[PDB]
DNA sequence: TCAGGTAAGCAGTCCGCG
DNA sequence: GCGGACTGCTTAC
C-alpha cells in the first residue's frame, strides 16, 4: 500500500513523524530534515525556481531548521523578503508525500475517552488537579473496545466493583441500560488505588497510542486534568509519557476578555468533538453539554441520577461507571451520524497538514496552495504584517414588509468561489486597475466597458485572461468535490420523500427494508417494491435515507465552508495571500451581479406581462432573488388548477423553461461587459412557495431584511410530501428564544401561511390561556454570557449592565457561600427568567447555567416569583405582533357589526 | 469564544425629547 | 414611550 503520515512534529532540528508504512504498519521516525528557503536573484543567474510573479529565485539549503529560521530573522533585519514555506513540517510532508494521499482509516488509531473526578468543593480545576481521577473509559477504534479503568478506593469513598450484568439490564429492572451492542466490547479493570490505575493507563496508552484523540471537552478538561494529576502524583517526566515523543507544552489560548491553558501533546492530533461540532454542525445550541447534544442529535433520553454528581460515586457507583461508559459511546454515536472525524481526515490529508489544522482554513489553504505551486517549481511569498481594515460585503435589498402569496426564489451556485473563477481573482493574476464609475452605472450598463484586454470587477481591478491563477485552480478542485457530495445529499432527500409518500399506505405484512444505495435516485423497480412494504420496513428505510442525507450534508456543506473561507481569508491579515483588492473584487462583483440580475428579471417579467416599471423581484440577499409569482398564477387563473401540486408543476416548468434561460442570457451579457475569463454565474430556481390550493393561507411574508417566512412545496428539485416552512431570521430560528416559544411561534406562522387569519386567532387565544403551565426551562430565554467581571460592582450591576448579566449577578448573590452550587462560567450560555416586583432576589431577573435545572437551593422561589406576563409579552407577543403587522393580519379578532345577533 | 469574511436584525441601557 | 447612540448577542448570507 501507499504510505501515509499519521502525525508530524518539529522538535528542535528534528522532524518526528508517526506514519503507516507500505505494509500497513504504524512506525515512528526522527528525521534531521534540511529545509529550503528562497531569495530573489538576478536574471543573469540560471534557475528553475520562480516566485508567483515570475521573478527568479535562488534556493538556499540549510544545515538544519534552526539555521533556516535564523536566516529569516536576518533577512528581516536586512529588509529583504525571505521566500518559501516557513512551516518546516508542511515542507517535510510535501517532500515526503509528493502524490495524492490515499489513507486507510482502519489503520488510524482513533481514541475516544472521558474521565470522572469526584469533587466536593466545586468544579475540579484542570490546572490544580487536586482530586483523584476515579474513572476513565477509553474507546479504541482499532480494537473496537471500551477500556474501563475504575477506582475502587478513594479518600471520597471505597466502593464495590461495577457489575456488567446490572449495567445491561433495563432501568425498569434496576439497571443502567448500557446498550446491548457494546456490552461485549467492554474490558473492565478495577483498581485498589489511584497510583496503580494511572500507571496502568500510561502503560496502556504506550501500547495503544492515539493518533486522533477525541471526546467531549477533552482539550479543555480531560487532557489537562489527566496530565496535571499524573504530574502532581508522579512528576513531569511521567506525565509527558502521554506524548509519544515525550514532549508537551502548556499552550495559552487567548480570547477577547481572558485566557485559558491547554496541554499540547506532541505527536498526537487532538480533535475535541465539541469543537468539531461547533465548526461543522451548522447549529447554534442553547447548551453544549453532551446530554443536551446527544438528545438533539440522537433523540436519546437524558441520563438521570439522584443527588449531585459529587455524591454519585459514593451513593451509586454502579450508575456512576455505566454513565461514564455511555458518555463515551454517545460521542461515537454522534460521529456515526455526523461523520466529522471522516471529514477532518479527508480535508487534512488533501491539504497535507496536521489533522488538527482543519480548524484553521488559513492553514488549510496555505498548504493547498503551497503544494500546488511547488509542483510547478514556483516559490510562495513571505507572509507580511498588515493592519486590520474594514471592507464592504454583500448587498441586501430592503423588502416592502407585507404578505406575499406566490413566491419563486432563485440563487447563484457557490457565488464567491464562482466569482473567483469567473473573474480569475488570484494574487499573481492582478493585471492592473481601471477608472471606476459608481456601482449603479455598472448595474444599469451605462458605464464605459472597463477593459478590452483584461477580466474585470466593478471595484476597479483587472486580471489576466491567459491562464488560471492558483486560487481559481485550487478552489475549483474543492468546488467539484462539493458538487459531487451535494448530489448524493439531494438524492437521499428525494428518496426520503418517496418513502414518506409510501408511508401513507403501508402494507399489512412482515418484510425487510430494501438493500439500496440512498445516494442515488430510486429506480422504478425500487419504487414498486417500496409501495408493497410494511410501515416498519419503510420507517427503517426512512431512517437510513435520512442518515445518508446527513452524511452528504456534512461532506457538502463543509467543503462549501472551506471554499467560501478562501474568499474570506483574502480579507484576513494572517493569510499569506491577504489582499483587500482581491477581497473587495469578490464582494463588489457580487453586489453588481445581484442588482444586475434583479433588473434583468424585472425587465423580462414586465415584457411577459406587458407592463412597465413594476417590481417582480421583492427581495434579495447576497446572491438570491425572490420573485412574486402572483401575476403568473393569475394569468391562467386559480380555478384552472386541479390541486396544489398542479400549480407547483406549472411554476416549476415556468422557472426552468422561461426564467432560467432569461437569467442565463442576462448573466452572459454581464460576463462580456466585465470581459471575464469564463461565464460561471449559474442562478437556478430554489423555492416554489404558496398557500395550499383553496385555503385562506397567506403563503408567505417579509418583516424586513433577513426576516421572512415561506410555505415551500419544492426546494431545489425536492417535491415534499408535506409542505415545509422555510423561516429565516425570525425568532423561531434564534437559540435565544425560549424552546416552547419557538414552537408556538412556528405554529402561528404555519397557521398564517397555510390556514389564515381565523386559525391564527384560535391558536393565539389558546396559547395565551395555557402558557403558565409550561415547564420553566422551556420558557426561559437563552444568552451567551461575556464580561461578567466588567459589570460586577460588589455583586451588583455596574453602569450599562446587560439584562442577562444582571440575571447572573442576581444568581451569584442567591448562591453566595455555596461551594457545591453550580457556577456560571464566563463565555458560556445561561437560561434567563424575569422576576416579579418585590421578589426575595432583590432584582428583576435571574440567570443560571443553560442545559441545567436551577439548583434546589433556590428553585422553589424562582418558580414562585417567575414573571409570566413579562415573559409572554417579550418573547411571544412582541415577535408575533411584528409578524402579523407585516402580514397585514390581526392575531386578535377585531369587533364587527355582527356581534351580537343572538336571542 | 483559538481557528475565513460582511450585513443586519432585535433586546436592552441610557437619556433626550419642551 | 419612542428613537438615537451605543453594547451585546445572534442571525443570513
Ligand atoms: N458562511 C458563509 C455563507 C455565505 N457567504 C457568502 C459566500 C457565498 O458564496 C455567498 C452566498 O451564500 P450561500 O449561502 O448562497 O452559499 P453559496 O452560494 O456559496 O453556495 P450554494 O448556494 O450553492 O449552496 O455568501 C460567506 O462568505 N460565508
Ligand atoms: Ca461525567
Ligand atoms: Ca461500537
Ligand atoms: Ca442553492
Ligand atoms: Ca448561493
Ligand atoms: Ca403500500
Ligand atoms: Ca443564497
Ligand atoms: Ca468588580
PDB file of C-alpha atoms in Angstrom, chain A residues 89-350:
ATOM      1  CA  UNK A  89       6.773  20.300   8.809  1.00  0.00           C
ATOM      2  CA  UNK A  90       4.456  21.293   5.940  1.00  0.00           C
ATOM      3  CA  UNK A  91       7.531  21.378   3.678  1.00  0.00           C
ATOM      4  CA  UNK A  92       8.577  17.961   5.042  1.00  0.00           C
ATOM      5  CA  UNK A  93       5.143  16.465   4.305  1.00  0.00           C
ATOM      6  CA  UNK A  94       5.216  17.971   0.826  1.00  0.00           C
ATOM      7  CA  UNK A  95       8.608  16.328   0.141  1.00  0.00           C
ATOM      8  CA  UNK A  96       7.743  13.006   1.804  1.00  0.00           C
ATOM      9  CA  UNK A  97       4.255  12.573   0.303  1.00  0.00           C
ATOM     10  CA  UNK A  98       4.602  14.084  -3.165  1.00  0.00           C
ATOM     11  CA  UNK A  99       1.412  12.482  -4.532  1.00  0.00           C
ATOM     12  CA  UNK A 100      -2.322  12.431  -3.772  1.00  0.00           C
ATOM     13  CA  UNK A 101      -2.545  10.738  -0.363  1.00  0.00           C
ATOM     14  CA  UNK A 102      -4.802   7.710  -0.150  1.00  0.00           C
ATOM     15  CA  UNK A 103      -5.404   6.952   3.523  1.00  0.00           C
ATOM     16  CA  UNK A 104      -6.825   3.861   5.206  1.00  0.00           C
ATOM     17  CA  UNK A 105      -8.831   4.908   8.257  1.00  0.00           C
ATOM     18  CA  UNK A 106      -8.774   1.350   9.658  1.00  0.00           C
ATOM     19  CA  UNK A 107      -5.029   1.743  10.339  1.00  0.00           C
ATOM     20  CA  UNK A 108      -5.533   5.061  12.141  1.00  0.00           C
ATOM     21  CA  UNK A 109      -5.896   4.795  15.919  1.00  0.00           C
ATOM     22  CA  UNK A 110      -8.855   6.953  16.921  1.00  0.00           C
ATOM     23  CA  UNK A 111      -9.278   7.214  20.668  1.00  0.00           C
ATOM     24  CA  UNK A 112     -12.410   8.493  22.369  1.00  0.00           C
ATOM     25  CA  UNK A 113     -12.118   8.951  26.152  1.00  0.00           C
ATOM     26  CA  UNK A 114     -13.849  10.504  29.179  1.00  0.00           C
ATOM     27  CA  UNK A 115     -12.824  10.757  32.835  1.00  0.00           C
ATOM     28  CA  UNK A 116     -14.673  11.105  36.144  1.00  0.00           C
ATOM     29  CA  UNK A 117     -13.428  13.191  39.082  1.00  0.00           C
ATOM     30  CA  UNK A 118     -15.272  13.402  42.421  1.00  0.00           C
ATOM     31  CA  UNK A 119     -15.096  16.905  43.885  1.00  0.00           C
ATOM     32  CA  UNK A 120     -16.969  18.201  46.978  1.00  0.00           C
ATOM     33  CA  UNK A 121     -15.616  21.784  46.809  1.00  0.00           C
ATOM     34  CA  UNK A 122     -16.979  22.690  43.364  1.00  0.00           C
ATOM     35  CA  UNK A 123     -15.641  22.263  39.838  1.00  0.00           C
ATOM     36  CA  UNK A 124     -12.302  20.381  39.728  1.00  0.00           C
ATOM     37  CA  UNK A 125      -9.882  22.782  38.009  1.00  0.00           C
ATOM     38  CA  UNK A 126      -7.611  21.013  35.483  1.00  0.00           C
ATOM     39  CA  UNK A 127      -4.690  23.337  36.350  1.00  0.00           C
ATOM     40  CA  UNK A 128      -4.788  22.308  40.012  1.00  0.00           C
ATOM     41  CA  UNK A 129      -5.850  18.648  39.593  1.00  0.00           C
ATOM     42  CA  UNK A 130      -6.208  18.263  43.373  1.00  0.00           C
ATOM     43  CA  UNK A 131      -8.797  15.465  43.295  1.00  0.00           C
ATOM     44  CA  UNK A 132      -8.343  11.776  42.357  1.00  0.00           C
ATOM     45  CA  UNK A 133      -9.305  10.506  38.907  1.00  0.00           C
ATOM     46  CA  UNK A 134     -11.799   7.779  39.826  1.00  0.00           C
ATOM     47  CA  UNK A 135     -12.935   6.593  36.384  1.00  0.00           C
ATOM     48  CA  UNK A 136     -11.585   6.524  32.841  1.00  0.00           C
ATOM     49  CA  UNK A 137     -13.351   4.996  29.864  1.00  0.00           C
ATOM     50  CA  UNK A 138     -11.144   4.860  26.788  1.00  0.00           C
ATOM     51  CA  UNK A 139     -12.530   3.557  23.476  1.00  0.00           C
ATOM     52  CA  UNK A 140     -10.019   2.379  20.852  1.00  0.00           C
ATOM     53  CA  UNK A 141     -11.099   2.315  17.195  1.00  0.00           C
ATOM     54  CA  UNK A 142      -8.577  -0.359  16.164  1.00  0.00           C
ATOM     55  CA  UNK A 143      -9.505  -2.818  18.939  1.00  0.00           C
ATOM     56  CA  UNK A 144     -13.153  -1.673  18.876  1.00  0.00           C
ATOM     57  CA  UNK A 145     -13.198  -1.962  22.688  1.00  0.00           C
ATOM     58  CA  UNK A 146     -14.179   0.249  25.622  1.00  0.00           C
ATOM     59  CA  UNK A 147     -11.410   0.064  28.220  1.00  0.00           C
ATOM     60  CA  UNK A 148     -12.788   0.933  31.654  1.00  0.00           C
ATOM     61  CA  UNK A 149     -10.430   1.976  34.456  1.00  0.00           C
ATOM     62  CA  UNK A 150     -12.354   2.035  37.744  1.00  0.00           C
ATOM     63  CA  UNK A 151     -11.050   3.337  41.094  1.00  0.00           C
ATOM     64  CA  UNK A 152     -12.478   1.298  43.964  1.00  0.00           C
ATOM     65  CA  UNK A 153     -10.639   3.076  46.800  1.00  0.00           C
ATOM     66  CA  UNK A 154     -10.598   6.840  47.267  1.00  0.00           C
ATOM     67  CA  UNK A 155     -10.442   9.409  50.091  1.00  0.00           C
ATOM     68  CA  UNK A 156     -14.024  10.205  48.980  1.00  0.00           C
ATOM     69  CA  UNK A 157     -15.201   6.609  49.417  1.00  0.00           C
ATOM     70  CA  UNK A 158     -14.462   2.917  48.998  1.00  0.00           C
ATOM     71  CA  UNK A 159     -16.797   1.151  46.560  1.00  0.00           C
ATOM     72  CA  UNK A 160     -17.642  -2.302  45.214  1.00  0.00           C
ATOM     73  CA  UNK A 161     -16.867  -3.380  41.634  1.00  0.00           C
ATOM     74  CA  UNK A 162     -19.087  -2.321  38.748  1.00  0.00           C
ATOM     75  CA  UNK A 163     -21.378  -5.100  37.533  1.00  0.00           C
ATOM     76  CA  UNK A 164     -21.695  -5.624  33.770  1.00  0.00           C
ATOM     77  CA  UNK A 165     -24.810  -7.749  34.380  1.00  0.00           C
ATOM     78  CA  UNK A 166     -26.655  -4.895  36.141  1.00  0.00           C
ATOM     79  CA  UNK A 167     -25.306  -2.388  33.594  1.00  0.00           C
ATOM     80  CA  UNK A 168     -27.014  -4.381  30.811  1.00  0.00           C
ATOM     81  CA  UNK A 169     -30.442  -4.594  32.486  1.00  0.00           C
ATOM     82  CA  UNK A 170     -33.311  -2.184  31.806  1.00  0.00           C
ATOM     83  CA  UNK A 171     -33.758   0.883  34.032  1.00  0.00           C
ATOM     84  CA  UNK A 172     -37.036  -0.867  34.940  1.00  0.00           C
ATOM     85  CA  UNK A 173     -35.032  -3.870  36.236  1.00  0.00           C
ATOM     86  CA  UNK A 174     -32.832  -1.548  38.322  1.00  0.00           C
ATOM     87  CA  UNK A 175     -30.198  -1.497  35.583  1.00  0.00           C
ATOM     88  CA  UNK A 176     -28.354   1.204  33.670  1.00  0.00           C
ATOM     89  CA  UNK A 177     -29.398   0.300  30.106  1.00  0.00           C
ATOM     90  CA  UNK A 178     -25.870   0.191  28.718  1.00  0.00           C
ATOM     91  CA  UNK A 179     -26.637  -0.548  25.021  1.00  0.00           C
ATOM     92  CA  UNK A 180     -26.629  -4.260  24.221  1.00  0.00           C
ATOM     93  CA  UNK A 181     -24.462  -3.642  21.126  1.00  0.00           C
ATOM     94  CA  UNK A 182     -21.482  -2.525  23.269  1.00  0.00           C
ATOM     95  CA  UNK A 183     -21.802  -4.857  26.296  1.00  0.00           C
ATOM     96  CA  UNK A 184     -19.500  -7.486  24.730  1.00  0.00           C
ATOM     97  CA  UNK A 185     -16.982  -4.748  23.837  1.00  0.00           C
ATOM     98  CA  UNK A 186     -16.301  -3.649  27.420  1.00  0.00           C
ATOM     99  CA  UNK A 187     -12.997  -4.553  29.082  1.00  0.00           C
ATOM    100  CA  UNK A 188     -13.342  -3.769  32.780  1.00  0.00           C
ATOM    101  CA  UNK A 189     -10.353  -3.051  35.026  1.00  0.00           C
ATOM    102  CA  UNK A 190     -10.875  -2.246  38.720  1.00  0.00           C
ATOM    103  CA  UNK A 191      -8.037  -0.769  40.819  1.00  0.00           C
ATOM    104  CA  UNK A 192      -7.456  -0.620  44.584  1.00  0.00           C
ATOM    105  CA  UNK A 193      -5.545   2.673  44.319  1.00  0.00           C
ATOM    106  CA  UNK A 194      -5.223   5.701  42.009  1.00  0.00           C
ATOM    107  CA  UNK A 195      -1.455   5.306  41.564  1.00  0.00           C
ATOM    108  CA  UNK A 196      -1.845   1.840  40.039  1.00  0.00           C
ATOM    109  CA  UNK A 197      -4.808   2.985  37.887  1.00  0.00           C
ATOM    110  CA  UNK A 198      -2.745   5.793  36.313  1.00  0.00           C
ATOM    111  CA  UNK A 199       0.413   3.697  35.899  1.00  0.00           C
ATOM    112  CA  UNK A 200      -1.616   1.035  34.065  1.00  0.00           C
ATOM    113  CA  UNK A 201      -3.354   3.739  31.988  1.00  0.00           C
ATOM    114  CA  UNK A 202       0.034   5.085  30.830  1.00  0.00           C
ATOM    115  CA  UNK A 203       1.273   1.572  30.002  1.00  0.00           C
ATOM    116  CA  UNK A 204      -1.957   1.035  28.089  1.00  0.00           C
ATOM    117  CA  UNK A 205      -1.523   4.447  26.390  1.00  0.00           C
ATOM    118  CA  UNK A 206       2.008   3.464  25.315  1.00  0.00           C
ATOM    119  CA  UNK A 207       0.765   0.196  23.791  1.00  0.00           C
ATOM    120  CA  UNK A 208      -2.215   1.841  22.078  1.00  0.00           C
ATOM    121  CA  UNK A 209      -1.073   5.425  21.440  1.00  0.00           C
ATOM    122  CA  UNK A 210      -3.897   7.540  19.987  1.00  0.00           C
ATOM    123  CA  UNK A 211      -3.282   9.238  16.665  1.00  0.00           C
ATOM    124  CA  UNK A 212      -6.592  11.098  16.677  1.00  0.00           C
ATOM    125  CA  UNK A 213      -7.673  11.943  20.204  1.00  0.00           C
ATOM    126  CA  UNK A 214     -11.280  12.987  20.760  1.00  0.00           C
ATOM    127  CA  UNK A 215     -14.140  13.036  23.270  1.00  0.00           C
ATOM    128  CA  UNK A 216     -16.307  15.772  24.786  1.00  0.00           C
ATOM    129  CA  UNK A 217     -14.387  18.749  26.236  1.00  0.00           C
ATOM    130  CA  UNK A 218     -11.169  16.671  26.215  1.00  0.00           C
ATOM    131  CA  UNK A 219      -8.904  19.570  25.183  1.00  0.00           C
ATOM    132  CA  UNK A 220     -10.209  21.890  27.922  1.00  0.00           C
ATOM    133  CA  UNK A 221     -10.829  19.334  30.700  1.00  0.00           C
ATOM    134  CA  UNK A 222      -9.894  15.637  30.340  1.00  0.00           C
ATOM    135  CA  UNK A 223      -6.426  16.041  28.798  1.00  0.00           C
ATOM    136  CA  UNK A 224      -5.190  18.849  31.120  1.00  0.00           C
ATOM    137  CA  UNK A 225      -6.663  17.101  34.183  1.00  0.00           C
ATOM    138  CA  UNK A 226      -5.027  13.733  33.402  1.00  0.00           C
ATOM    139  CA  UNK A 227      -1.700  15.417  32.545  1.00  0.00           C
ATOM    140  CA  UNK A 228      -1.692  17.635  35.665  1.00  0.00           C
ATOM    141  CA  UNK A 229      -2.861  14.857  38.007  1.00  0.00           C
ATOM    142  CA  UNK A 230      -0.128  12.483  36.827  1.00  0.00           C
ATOM    143  CA  UNK A 231       2.303  15.420  37.132  1.00  0.00           C
ATOM    144  CA  UNK A 232       1.220  16.126  40.739  1.00  0.00           C
ATOM    145  CA  UNK A 233       1.464  12.471  41.802  1.00  0.00           C
ATOM    146  CA  UNK A 234       4.471  11.233  39.790  1.00  0.00           C
ATOM    147  CA  UNK A 235       6.304  14.268  38.382  1.00  0.00           C
ATOM    148  CA  UNK A 236       6.630  15.863  34.929  1.00  0.00           C
ATOM    149  CA  UNK A 237       8.604  13.113  33.167  1.00  0.00           C
ATOM    150  CA  UNK A 238       5.858  10.568  33.842  1.00  0.00           C
ATOM    151  CA  UNK A 239       3.086  12.931  32.642  1.00  0.00           C
ATOM    152  CA  UNK A 240       4.984  13.582  29.386  1.00  0.00           C
ATOM    153  CA  UNK A 241       4.525   9.884  28.533  1.00  0.00           C
ATOM    154  CA  UNK A 242       1.114  10.943  27.181  1.00  0.00           C
ATOM    155  CA  UNK A 243       3.225  12.233  24.273  1.00  0.00           C
ATOM    156  CA  UNK A 244       4.807   9.556  22.038  1.00  0.00           C
ATOM    157  CA  UNK A 245       7.813  11.881  21.679  1.00  0.00           C
ATOM    158  CA  UNK A 246       7.849  12.725  25.414  1.00  0.00           C
ATOM    159  CA  UNK A 247       7.247  16.401  24.653  1.00  0.00           C
ATOM    160  CA  UNK A 248       4.431  18.606  25.891  1.00  0.00           C
ATOM    161  CA  UNK A 249       3.795  22.339  26.127  1.00  0.00           C
ATOM    162  CA  UNK A 250       1.277  24.369  28.098  1.00  0.00           C
ATOM    163  CA  UNK A 251      -0.400  26.466  25.404  1.00  0.00           C
ATOM    164  CA  UNK A 252      -2.122  29.710  26.359  1.00  0.00           C
ATOM    165  CA  UNK A 253      -5.325  30.245  24.378  1.00  0.00           C
ATOM    166  CA  UNK A 254      -6.255  33.944  24.313  1.00  0.00           C
ATOM    167  CA  UNK A 255      -9.688  35.417  23.682  1.00  0.00           C
ATOM    168  CA  UNK A 256     -11.098  38.963  23.819  1.00  0.00           C
ATOM    169  CA  UNK A 257     -11.698  39.004  27.607  1.00  0.00           C
ATOM    170  CA  UNK A 258      -9.346  36.386  29.089  1.00  0.00           C
ATOM    171  CA  UNK A 259      -7.303  33.236  28.543  1.00  0.00           C
ATOM    172  CA  UNK A 260      -7.210  29.503  29.268  1.00  0.00           C
ATOM    173  CA  UNK A 261      -4.500  26.830  29.237  1.00  0.00           C
ATOM    174  CA  UNK A 262      -4.369  23.607  27.244  1.00  0.00           C
ATOM    175  CA  UNK A 263      -1.715  20.895  27.010  1.00  0.00           C
ATOM    176  CA  UNK A 264      -0.214  20.300  23.590  1.00  0.00           C
ATOM    177  CA  UNK A 265       0.770  16.635  23.278  1.00  0.00           C
ATOM    178  CA  UNK A 266       3.424  16.441  20.570  1.00  0.00           C
ATOM    179  CA  UNK A 267       2.803  13.512  18.207  1.00  0.00           C
ATOM    180  CA  UNK A 268      -0.946  13.432  18.881  1.00  0.00           C
ATOM    181  CA  UNK A 269      -3.764  15.137  16.952  1.00  0.00           C
ATOM    182  CA  UNK A 270      -6.440  16.292  19.364  1.00  0.00           C
ATOM    183  CA  UNK A 271      -9.849  16.848  17.761  1.00  0.00           C
ATOM    184  CA  UNK A 272     -12.198  17.704  20.637  1.00  0.00           C
ATOM    185  CA  UNK A 273     -15.673  16.726  19.401  1.00  0.00           C
ATOM    186  CA  UNK A 274     -17.304  19.826  20.970  1.00  0.00           C
ATOM    187  CA  UNK A 275     -15.016  21.910  18.736  1.00  0.00           C
ATOM    188  CA  UNK A 276     -15.671  19.678  15.708  1.00  0.00           C
ATOM    189  CA  UNK A 277     -19.406  20.030  16.396  1.00  0.00           C
ATOM    190  CA  UNK A 278     -19.254  23.839  16.744  1.00  0.00           C
ATOM    191  CA  UNK A 279     -17.356  24.290  13.462  1.00  0.00           C
ATOM    192  CA  UNK A 280     -19.078  21.676  11.305  1.00  0.00           C
ATOM    193  CA  UNK A 281     -22.680  21.094  12.526  1.00  0.00           C
ATOM    194  CA  UNK A 282     -24.104  24.485  11.441  1.00  0.00           C
ATOM    195  CA  UNK A 283     -26.224  24.742  14.560  1.00  0.00           C
ATOM    196  CA  UNK A 284     -26.207  27.209  17.425  1.00  0.00           C
ATOM    197  CA  UNK A 285     -27.274  25.391  20.568  1.00  0.00           C
ATOM    198  CA  UNK A 286     -28.743  26.722  23.847  1.00  0.00           C
ATOM    199  CA  UNK A 287     -26.336  24.317  25.590  1.00  0.00           C
ATOM    200  CA  UNK A 288     -23.273  22.272  24.626  1.00  0.00           C
ATOM    201  CA  UNK A 289     -23.484  19.679  27.396  1.00  0.00           C
ATOM    202  CA  UNK A 290     -23.096  16.162  25.984  1.00  0.00           C
ATOM    203  CA  UNK A 291     -26.513  15.354  27.451  1.00  0.00           C
ATOM    204  CA  UNK A 292     -28.160  18.217  25.505  1.00  0.00           C
ATOM    205  CA  UNK A 293     -26.369  17.492  22.235  1.00  0.00           C
ATOM    206  CA  UNK A 294     -26.942  13.710  22.417  1.00  0.00           C
ATOM    207  CA  UNK A 295     -30.639  14.443  22.960  1.00  0.00           C
ATOM    208  CA  UNK A 296     -30.676  16.811  19.973  1.00  0.00           C
ATOM    209  CA  UNK A 297     -28.745  14.531  17.601  1.00  0.00           C
ATOM    210  CA  UNK A 298     -29.891  11.036  18.578  1.00  0.00           C
ATOM    211  CA  UNK A 299     -33.205  11.516  20.417  1.00  0.00           C
ATOM    212  CA  UNK A 300     -31.788   9.511  23.346  1.00  0.00           C
ATOM    213  CA  UNK A 301     -33.156  10.246  26.825  1.00  0.00           C
ATOM    214  CA  UNK A 302     -31.413  12.321  29.494  1.00  0.00           C
ATOM    215  CA  UNK A 303     -29.203  10.209  31.784  1.00  0.00           C
ATOM    216  CA  UNK A 304     -30.957  10.629  35.132  1.00  0.00           C
ATOM    217  CA  UNK A 305     -29.380  10.209  38.558  1.00  0.00           C
ATOM    218  CA  UNK A 306     -30.346  11.153  42.123  1.00  0.00           C
ATOM    219  CA  UNK A 307     -28.469  13.867  44.033  1.00  0.00           C
ATOM    220  CA  UNK A 308     -25.435  15.914  42.956  1.00  0.00           C
ATOM    221  CA  UNK A 309     -22.702  14.446  40.729  1.00  0.00           C
ATOM    222  CA  UNK A 310     -20.311  14.982  43.674  1.00  0.00           C
ATOM    223  CA  UNK A 311     -22.099  12.236  45.647  1.00  0.00           C
ATOM    224  CA  UNK A 312     -22.973   9.955  42.716  1.00  0.00           C
ATOM    225  CA  UNK A 313     -19.904   7.715  43.097  1.00  0.00           C
ATOM    226  CA  UNK A 314     -20.490   7.180  46.839  1.00  0.00           C
ATOM    227  CA  UNK A 315     -24.276   6.743  46.572  1.00  0.00           C
ATOM    228  CA  UNK A 316     -24.437   4.854  43.251  1.00  0.00           C
ATOM    229  CA  UNK A 317     -21.043   3.721  41.910  1.00  0.00           C
ATOM    230  CA  UNK A 318     -22.759   1.208  39.612  1.00  0.00           C
ATOM    231  CA  UNK A 319     -24.593   4.028  37.782  1.00  0.00           C
ATOM    232  CA  UNK A 320     -21.536   6.300  38.026  1.00  0.00           C
ATOM    233  CA  UNK A 321     -19.432   3.901  35.926  1.00  0.00           C
ATOM    234  CA  UNK A 322     -22.240   2.979  33.497  1.00  0.00           C
ATOM    235  CA  UNK A 323     -22.833   6.669  32.741  1.00  0.00           C
ATOM    236  CA  UNK A 324     -19.112   7.207  32.102  1.00  0.00           C
ATOM    237  CA  UNK A 325     -19.141   4.359  29.543  1.00  0.00           C
ATOM    238  CA  UNK A 326     -22.379   5.634  27.945  1.00  0.00           C
ATOM    239  CA  UNK A 327     -20.885   9.147  27.679  1.00  0.00           C
ATOM    240  CA  UNK A 328     -18.014   7.787  25.555  1.00  0.00           C
ATOM    241  CA  UNK A 329     -20.474   5.801  23.412  1.00  0.00           C
ATOM    242  CA  UNK A 330     -22.701   8.832  22.728  1.00  0.00           C
ATOM    243  CA  UNK A 331     -19.792  10.716  21.106  1.00  0.00           C
ATOM    244  CA  UNK A 332     -19.192   7.682  18.834  1.00  0.00           C
ATOM    245  CA  UNK A 333     -22.919   7.638  18.014  1.00  0.00           C
ATOM    246  CA  UNK A 334     -22.910  11.333  17.127  1.00  0.00           C
ATOM    247  CA  UNK A 335     -19.908  10.689  14.885  1.00  0.00           C
ATOM    248  CA  UNK A 336     -21.540   7.666  13.217  1.00  0.00           C
ATOM    249  CA  UNK A 337     -24.250  10.171  12.194  1.00  0.00           C
ATOM    250  CA  UNK A 338     -22.382  13.446  11.534  1.00  0.00           C
ATOM    251  CA  UNK A 339     -19.077  11.912  10.348  1.00  0.00           C
ATOM    252  CA  UNK A 340     -16.886  14.880  11.407  1.00  0.00           C
ATOM    253  CA  UNK A 341     -13.789  12.691  12.002  1.00  0.00           C
ATOM    254  CA  UNK A 342     -14.080  11.380   8.426  1.00  0.00           C
ATOM    255  CA  UNK A 343     -14.388  14.971   7.189  1.00  0.00           C
ATOM    256  CA  UNK A 344     -11.318  16.088   9.185  1.00  0.00           C
ATOM    257  CA  UNK A 345      -9.245  13.175   7.837  1.00  0.00           C
ATOM    258  CA  UNK A 346     -10.397  13.821   4.231  1.00  0.00           C
ATOM    259  CA  UNK A 347      -9.542  17.544   4.407  1.00  0.00           C
ATOM    260  CA  UNK A 348      -6.293  17.147   6.383  1.00  0.00           C
ATOM    261  CA  UNK A 349      -4.817  14.564   4.011  1.00  0.00           C
ATOM    262  CA  UNK A 350      -5.988  16.580   0.988  1.00  0.00           C
TER     263      UNK A 350
END
